């Protein structure tokens, strides 16, 4: 629409000190089940607490590096000549898309509990390989085809 | 039909199982406020005017 | 059920045909009928609205109403079903 109509803001964590704790609640939390959502998030820094026992931001922020790409895409046409001319949006939206990525693979895995397949992707996020880095290189390799800007 | 459907339920039938009530202008079927003895549809014909403390502009 | 329910005038034909003769049909009406164990072995009609159905009774006919004595709920039936 026309304007920069305002967004909303949730508060950052005092427990493990990240706003993406409660934004991780903003993607795992479905049907407004915020207490179960915090049970999964606090249970996931508990998944850090068995595996490494370190700060949440090691696995959580290396995970953020895995799931925050550089580039995203856009449809831009001449009259049908859809040059996929790209953009590189800011870390609130990039972090938001990475939250879609961790809710994606840390949701849709046929394992035992939400903290068990989210133990597969928060613990494999502690293994910091595979699906996330490919889940951004799937757009990163396209940029050479996205070399055109407004040329023809 | 206006008298087998107005006058008939005015005539004593068996019970409430038989003679279901309605307003007394036109014997219109249910959706009838028996708490105010009048039909919705026929009480709406008043609610052209309205003699009620309800707000009139369709809240 | 507690506080049972039963016919009245063709209850007086249960008591007017149980004593006299177990034979005839009736211009019946019943959504309010039953069957007693004494009632078995006779013939009664079922009011669909045109055909007072002449059915004798067997002990299988437990105490239902004449709205469900025989399936006189007319629906044809053998055309396109199941």
């Amino acid at each position: 629409r026309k304007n920069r109509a305002p967004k909303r803001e949730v508060l950052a964590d005092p427990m493990y000190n990240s706003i993406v704790v409660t934004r991780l609640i903003n993607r795992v939390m479905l049907d407004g089940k915020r207490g179960v959502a915090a049970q999964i998030v606090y249970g996931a820094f508990k998944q850090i607490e068995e595996a490494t026992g370190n700060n949440p931001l090691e696995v959580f922020e290396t995970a953020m590096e895995n799931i925050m790409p550089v580039l995203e895409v856009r449809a831009r046409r001449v009259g049908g000549s859809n040059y996929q001319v790209p953009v590189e949006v800011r870390p609130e939206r990039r972090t938001t898309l990475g939250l879609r990525w961790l809710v994606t693979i840390a949701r849709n895995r046929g394992e035992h509990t939400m903290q068990d397949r989210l133990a597969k992707e928060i613990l494999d996020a502690a293994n910091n390989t595979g699906a996330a880095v490919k889940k951004r290189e799937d757009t990163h390799k396209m940029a050479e085809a996205n070399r055109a800007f407004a040329h023809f | 039909a206006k008298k087998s459907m107005v006058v008939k339920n005015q005539r004593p039938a068996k019970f409430s199982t038989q003679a279901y009530t309605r307003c007394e202008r036109c014997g219109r079927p249910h959706s009838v406020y028996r708490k105010f003895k009048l039909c919705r549809i026929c009480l709406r014909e008043l609610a052209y005017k309205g003699q009620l403390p309800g707000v009139k502009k369709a809240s | 059920k507690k506080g049972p329910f039963v016919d009245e005038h063709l209850m007086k034909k249960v008591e007017a045909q149980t004593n006299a003769e177990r034979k005839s049909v009736i211009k019946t009406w019943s959504r309010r009928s039953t069957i007693f164990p004494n009632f078995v072995g006779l013939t009664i009609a079922v009011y669909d609205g045109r055909k007072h159905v002449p059915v004798y009774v067997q002990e299988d006919m437990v105490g239902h109403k004449l709205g469900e004595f025989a399936p006189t709920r007319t629906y044809r039936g053998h055309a396109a079903d199941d």
Binding site: - | - | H64, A70, D81
Partner: protein
């Protein structure tokens, strides 16, 4: 015997290990869960040694599972033609609540 000795599962309670069985369930299988004093039990891959021997005739209160088969059979197959206002609808196949069969009840109704 065998009734309780029929087709043992592991990992379960005996109550689900008897709703598992054709019949005895949440009223009665919990009733003889307590009457044999079982109470979860198993999750074991062992039922007991002798609460079997209780639950032979303690379980054998239902008359019978094979006469649940012959109780549906002995019930309805006499109950064919009372009307047959209900038996024809039940065995032609529609759920005979007196149920609105216009569109839905699609699986038992038959597409």
């Amino acid at each position: 015997a065998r009734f309780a000795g029929v087709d043992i599962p592991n990992e379960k309670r005996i109550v689900i290990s008897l709703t598992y069985v054709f019949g005895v369930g949440l009223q009665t299988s919990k009733k003889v869960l307590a009457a044999a004093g079982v109470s979860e039990d198993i999750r074991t891959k062992d039922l007991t040694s002798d609460q079997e021997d209780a639950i032979r005739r303690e379980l054998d209160g239902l008359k019978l599972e094979g006469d649940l088969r012959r109780e549906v059979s002995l019930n309805i197959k006499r109950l064919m033609e009372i009307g047959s206002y209900r038996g024809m609808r039940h065995r032609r196949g529609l759920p005979t609540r007196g149920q609105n069969t216009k569109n839905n009840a699609r699986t038992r109704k038959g597409p």
